[model samples]
Target chain A: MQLVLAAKYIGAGISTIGLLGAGIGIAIVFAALINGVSRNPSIKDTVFPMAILGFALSEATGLFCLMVSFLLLF
Target chain B: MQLVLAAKYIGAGISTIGLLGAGIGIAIVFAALINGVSRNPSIKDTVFPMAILGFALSEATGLFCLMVSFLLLF
Candidate 1:
């Protein structure tokens, strides 16, 4: 039982790394938004929607990682 | 052998977490494409191929994770 528990912790730890990508992705997305707006101020109208969608999608994958971590723990 | 087998299963599960990064990365790439195209409609011709390249490269990383998991299983 203890060994199994140990394995679960390791699994959860490994899964946590997924969050890093999510962070990087979100930053890339918003940074692109800022860059776009700067280059073409009028583009904000279109770019915002793309940024929001990207944030949601990136977050969804991160949430999946969190879910897997939780499942492994409990 | 039983303990080693258990470890293998756990390793596979852990490695599978890598897929999340790939998912987020692909989303970010496409988001970037949209942001760029929206900012400068004229850039689409130059940008579309770059988006495809980004998708392929991100997916390749994800596949490597899957391969690692498979190797662990067998």
Candidate 2:
């Protein structure tokens, strides 16, 4: 029983690292978007679609991490 | 063992709710991005980055839920 406990903790800890990728990816996207928008004020109208695409790509990284956590838990 | 099992179930139940936020966030970001992109084709490049950033921020909430689930299971 103790061994199981230890395993669970360790697994969770390791899986948590997965979040780092998503964090970094998100920051990059946001920065890029801000820069793009600033460069062309007229393009403000296009922000929504571009943001969504960026969001999907970034979220995919988080999903990967979530799966890793599940695998660890099981 | 029974306690641990019960905890796991509860954790999963709560963590699953985190998905709701992610789903909503994703949808909102996508909708906005699509609208923007349609208006300004040139802004596609800019919008993409922001969308990705939004995704990561949204995913963070889901990751929190997953972490809680692991802690509960353990």
Off by over 4 Å in 1: B1-5, B20-24, B42-74
| Candidate 1 local lDDT, residue B40 | 75
Candidate 2 local distance difference test against the native: 0.60
**Model 1, range B25-73, lDDT digits (tens) per residue?**
8777867787777667788788878877886788678668768766775
lDDT of each: 0.73, 0.60
Question: Which candidate leads in lDDT?
Answer: 1
Candidate 1 residue-wise lDDT, A1-74, digit = tens: 67767777787788677777778777777888887788888777766876776677666666666765676677
TM-score of chain B of 1: 0.89
Candidate maximizing DockQ = 1
iRMSD of prediction 1: 2.6
> TM per model?
0.70, 0.50
TM-score for candidate 1, residues paired by index: 0.70
